[PDB]
Design a protein around this motif. Structure first.
Motif, short mmCIF file in Angstrom:
data_model
loop_
_atom_site.label_atom_id
_atom_site.label_comp_id
_atom_site.label_asym_id
_atom_site.label_seq_id
_atom_site.Cartn_x
_atom_site.Cartn_y
_atom_site.Cartn_z
N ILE A 175 0.85 -1.18 0.00
CA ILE A 175 0.00 0.00 0.00
C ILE A 175 0.90 1.24 0.00
CG2 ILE A 175 -0.24 0.13 2.52
CD1 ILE A 175 -3.04 0.79 -0.07
N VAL A 176 2.17 1.03 0.37
CA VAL A 176 3.14 2.12 0.45
C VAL A 176 3.42 2.72 -0.92
CG1 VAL A 176 5.37 2.75 1.52
CG2 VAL A 176 4.10 0.74 2.33
N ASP A 177 3.20 1.94 -1.99
CA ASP A 177 3.32 2.45 -3.35
C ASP A 177 2.33 3.58 -3.61
OD1 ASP A 177 1.10 0.81 -3.17
OD2 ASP A 177 1.96 -0.77 -4.42
N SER A 178 1.10 3.44 -3.12
CA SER A 178 0.07 4.46 -3.29
C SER A 178 0.35 5.61 -2.32
CB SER A 178 -1.32 3.87 -3.07
OG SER A 178 -1.60 2.86 -4.02
N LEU A 179 1.17 6.56 -2.79
CA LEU A 179 1.43 7.80 -2.06
C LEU A 179 0.41 8.88 -2.35
CD1 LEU A 179 5.34 8.09 -2.30
CD2 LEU A 179 3.96 7.47 -0.34
N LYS A 180 -0.69 8.46 -3.00
CA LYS A 180 -1.81 9.28 -3.46
C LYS A 180 -1.37 10.63 -4.04
CE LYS A 180 -3.26 11.63 0.82
NZ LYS A 180 -4.39 12.44 1.35
N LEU A 181 -2.08 11.71 -3.70
CA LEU A 181 -2.01 12.97 -4.42
C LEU A 181 -0.80 13.83 -4.07
N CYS A 182 0.26 13.27 -3.46
CA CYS A 182 1.44 14.07 -3.10
C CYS A 182 2.11 14.68 -4.33
CB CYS A 182 2.44 13.21 -2.34
SG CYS A 182 2.29 13.26 -0.55
N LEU A 183 2.39 13.85 -5.33
CA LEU A 183 3.08 14.33 -6.53
C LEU A 183 2.22 15.32 -7.32
CD1 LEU A 183 5.93 13.75 -7.06
CD2 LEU A 183 5.30 11.89 -8.58
N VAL A 184 0.93 15.03 -7.46
CA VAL A 184 0.08 15.92 -8.26
C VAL A 184 -0.18 17.23 -7.51
CG1 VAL A 184 -2.11 14.87 -7.53
CG2 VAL A 184 -1.97 16.02 -9.73
N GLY A 185 -0.23 17.19 -6.18
CA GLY A 185 -0.33 18.43 -5.42
C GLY A 185 0.93 19.26 -5.48
N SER A 186 2.10 18.61 -5.44
CA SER A 186 3.36 19.32 -5.60
C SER A 186 3.46 19.96 -6.97
CB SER A 186 4.53 18.37 -5.36
OG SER A 186 5.73 18.89 -5.90
N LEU A 187 3.06 19.22 -8.02
CA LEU A 187 3.06 19.79 -9.36
C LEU A 187 2.02 20.89 -9.52
CD1 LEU A 187 3.41 16.37 -11.19
CD2 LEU A 187 5.14 18.17 -11.24
N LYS A 188 0.89 20.79 -8.82
CA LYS A 188 -0.12 21.84 -8.87
C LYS A 188 0.37 23.12 -8.22
CE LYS A 188 -4.34 19.08 -9.25
NZ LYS A 188 -5.42 18.41 -8.49
N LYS A 189 1.04 23.02 -7.06
CA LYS A 189 1.56 24.22 -6.43
C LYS A 189 2.75 24.79 -7.21
CE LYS A 189 0.71 25.32 -2.01
NZ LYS A 189 0.83 25.35 -0.53
#
Ligand code: MN
Length: 738
Positions: free
Chosen positions: A549-563
């Motif tokens: 489940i550790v693979d699913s880091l969810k929206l961290c990368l897309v939030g970083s790219l959004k900011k």
RNA sequence: UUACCAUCAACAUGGAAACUUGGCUC
RNA sequence: GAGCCAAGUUUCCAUGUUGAUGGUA
């Protein structure tokens, strides 16, 4: 470069023609020493030289497939049958031969009259005994044969083993001498939590419980199916005669579900392992301990050379080494590292290069910071016990506010009528409720108080998001140790309030440096902290944690790219990733599974297809480095890179010592590049790592790890034990966790 | 919890190989 | 006989975290 010594310790060249057998004992003897004695007695058939582990054996000559021997137990004249199988050939002397190499060299240590404790071997003839705390601190070496890019090495560093020269049974005897009323309860409290070690098989067990009704005279059943008593068990197998037949028995109920039946231990030949609590408070005992344990590079190399001389002196250990075709070198290995140039620390009106110390604690408090916000309307929460002391801070805060060009008004004078945790919480809530434009909130406490820190960060990162600062009276009440401490206090204040402290010139254009930390202390749920740079100067860092489940880091990368989209206005170029350390054997799980799973998250963004470099950062390294100065071995200079000969064979990696070492020998930090899709050169990638080693703002100097790595470590530490929650998004643009 | 660095002590996880046990499949 | 999966034992280790004591500012 740096003409360091040692690096990975001396080359141990080996030989060929190994053969792997599985010796089955019928009935099975549970003692390694007596089984070794039987297979040395049977040297007529098993040959002159054997390497025996306890169940798996190695010979230089090919036997037949099934060998049946009739051996005699040296305790009860029990006629037992030895069943030698024939399993493996192990011809090319690959990684498959490494455990056998460690077995023969561990016996080489063993017959030098060195005791086996833990994974290491220690020399009782070099005794440093403290009869004040009845213990011995006797030294030794943590020897393990490994394979690296340079080849087959034997890694051994100076380990000092704290053997309490009193058994666990002797410990309860001493307690019974002291206290004879509530002896059982305080003995159980002392024993539970810290391990004991059984010395007949050097095996360490946590004292889960102590059974005072259980006796060694009582009988138990083996896993094989035999009903035997503990005196009988130890006497026939290990040869141990039980002296006092009234002992308790220590139970070590293991973790999760036979496996988790129970494990039973005798206090007579199990010993304590830890530093006594009486030794900790004693200043002279700890002075002796840390003067004889933090060895200099001279003393560390001298102990290793003394080990080499002891091995070459004893004819039996050397005879074992040559009869198995092994050979130790005359001295330790000699290669050369590399010293990176010092990086220019940038402030607003000026910038400075650094000398050999790589510390700027006095070069900072003369010039203004690059961006300090107009710190006004802040508060200081203090108790009256630090009253006059606290007042002094305010004065010298102005005496520091001028030098670093940061404007400071007289704050709120807020009293703390008691040091209770919820009192702090409600008074900060009242201060924020009365005035909504409060920037910083600072509290002062007595001693190391982890739960106060927990609730202060709870309130100031979850409930009411404001930057905060916590101050202890252990240091702040020292007159001569106050100015350089208040400097760092004000620097942390400016950091957490959103102002950008000192920078370094980053020579890569438009990069998103990312550090993550997977914090899992057991209890608490594992949390991945995630810190990503969102500027070109990498001064403001977006932060987010996830809970696994550790693979699913969810929206961290897309939030970083959004900011990064909202800040840098539709120009993203690069991603640099700094992951926490994982065992070798978890590098493939990181490499070929998790990263080409998070690289598919970029398809949520509109056809980005970026570049990505992922590191694995390994910190606790038992390899030591000493500079080979023309007189002797001294401490290596900060900024030293060993990119070869001591690193892993499969991957690209390097060790970097990027800190000032005043005590002992430093620990280089292992960085393994598991993904290099951006085609980073090793020089550029380790220079970026050192540049981020400069970038950490909570210490005016370089550290062993990159700043995003320690940022993510502090953030995941917060969300693990200090928050148990995702941080509020309002503070995520600031370095609020410093 | 002003920090950073050493060294001890300790736990958890994972890799690899033998053996054992239980399942499917030639 | 024979391939794979799961678990345990024994050897070898590897990494992370924790606590402690010092050093320095
Ligand atoms: Mn970490």
């Amino acid at each position: 470069p740096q003409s360091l010594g040692l690096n990975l310790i001396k080359i141990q060249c080996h030989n060929e023609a190994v053969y792997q057998y599985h010796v089955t004992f019928s009935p099975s003897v549970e003692c390694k020493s007596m089984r070794f004695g039987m297979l040395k007695d049977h040297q007529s058939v098993t040959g002159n030289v054997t390497a025996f582990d306890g169940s798996i054996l190695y010979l230089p000559v090919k036997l037949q497939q099934v060998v049946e021997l009739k051996s005699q137990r040296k305790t009860d004249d029990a006629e037992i049958s030895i069943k030698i199988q024939l399993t493996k050939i192990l011809e090319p002397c690959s990684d498959l031969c490494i455990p056998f190499y460690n077995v023969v060299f561990r016996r080489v240590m063993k017959l030098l009259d060195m005791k086996l404790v833990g994974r290491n071997f220690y020399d009782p003839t070099s005794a440093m005994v403290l009869q004040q705390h009845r213990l011995q601190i006797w030294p030794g070496y943590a020897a393990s044969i490994r394979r690296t890019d340079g080849g087959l090495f034997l890694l051994a560093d100076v380990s000092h083993k704290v053997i309490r020269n009193d058994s666990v049974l002797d410990v309860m005897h001493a307690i019974y001498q002291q206290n004879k009323e509530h002896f059982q309860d305080e003995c159980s409290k002392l024993l539970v939590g810290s391990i004991v070690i059984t010395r007949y098989n050097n095996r360490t067990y946590r004292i889960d419980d102590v059974d005072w009704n259980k006796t060694p005279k009582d009988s138990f059943v083996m896993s094989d199916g035999k009903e035997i008593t503990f005196l009988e068990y130890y006497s026939k197998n290990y040869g141990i005669t039980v002296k006092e037949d009234d002992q308790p028995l220590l139970i070590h109920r293991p973790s999760e579900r036979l496996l988790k039946g129970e494990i039973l231990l005798l206090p007579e030949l199990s010993f304590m392992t830890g530093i006594p609590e009486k030794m900790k408070k004693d200043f002279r005992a700890m002075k002796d301990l840390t003067q004889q344990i933090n060895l200099s590079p001279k003393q560390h190399h001298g102990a290793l050379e003394c080990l080499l001389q002891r091995i070459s002196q004893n004819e039996t250990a050397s005879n074992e080494l040559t009869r198995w075709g092994l050979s130790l070198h005359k001295d330790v290995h000699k290669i050369e590292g590399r010293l990176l140039p010092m990086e220019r620390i940038n402030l607003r009106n000026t910038s400075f290069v650094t000398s050999e110390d790589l510390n700027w604690v006095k070069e900072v408090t003369r010039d203004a910071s690059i961006l300090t916000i107009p710190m006004h309307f802040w508060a200081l929460f203090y108790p009256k016990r630090a009253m006059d002391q606290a007042r002094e801070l305010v004065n010298m805060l102005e005496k520091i506010a001028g030098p670093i060009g940061m404007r400071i008004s007289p704050p709120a004078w807020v009293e703390l009528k008691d040091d209770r945790i919820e009192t702090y919480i409600r008074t900060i809530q009242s201060l924020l409720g009365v005035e909504g434009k409060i920037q910083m909130v600072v509290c002062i406490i007595m001693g190391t108080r982890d739960d106060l820190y927990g609730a202060i960060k709870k309130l100031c990162c979850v409930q009411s998001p404001v930057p905060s600062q916590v101050i202890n009276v252990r240091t702040i009440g020292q007159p001569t140790r106050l100015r350089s401490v208040a400097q760092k206090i004000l620097l942390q204040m400016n950091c957490k309030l959103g102002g950008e402290l000192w920078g370094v010139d980053i020579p890569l254009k438009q990069l998103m440096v990312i550090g993550m930390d997977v914090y899992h202390d057991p209890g608490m749920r594992s949390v991945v902290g995630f810190v990503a740079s969102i500027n070109l100067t990498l001064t403001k860092w977006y932060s987010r944690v996830v809970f696994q489940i550790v693979d699913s880091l969810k929206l961290c990368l897309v939030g970083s790219l959004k900011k990064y989209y909202e800040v840098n206005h539709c120009l993203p170029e690069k991603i640099v990733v700094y992951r926490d350390g994982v065992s070798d054997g978890q590098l493939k799980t990181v490499a070929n599974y998790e990263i080409p799973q998070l690289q598919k998250c970029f398809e949520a963004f509109d056809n980005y297809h970026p570049k990505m470099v992922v590191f694995v950062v390994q910190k606790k390294i038992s390899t030591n480095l000493y500079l080979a100065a023309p007189d002797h071995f001294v401490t290596p200079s900060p900024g030293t890179v060993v990119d070869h000969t001591i690193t892993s064979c499969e991957w690209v990696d390097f060790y970097l010592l990027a800190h000032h070492v005043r005590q002992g020998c430093g620990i280089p930090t292992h960085y393994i590049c598991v993904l290099n899709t951006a085609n980073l050169s090793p020089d550029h990638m380790q220079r970026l790592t050192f540049k981020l080693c400069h970038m950490y703002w909570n210490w005016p100097g370089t550290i062993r790890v990159p700043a995003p790595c320690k940022y993510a470590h502090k953030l995941a530490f917060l969300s693990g034990q200090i928050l148990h929650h995702e941080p509020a998004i309002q503070l995520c643009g600031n370095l609020f966790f410093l």
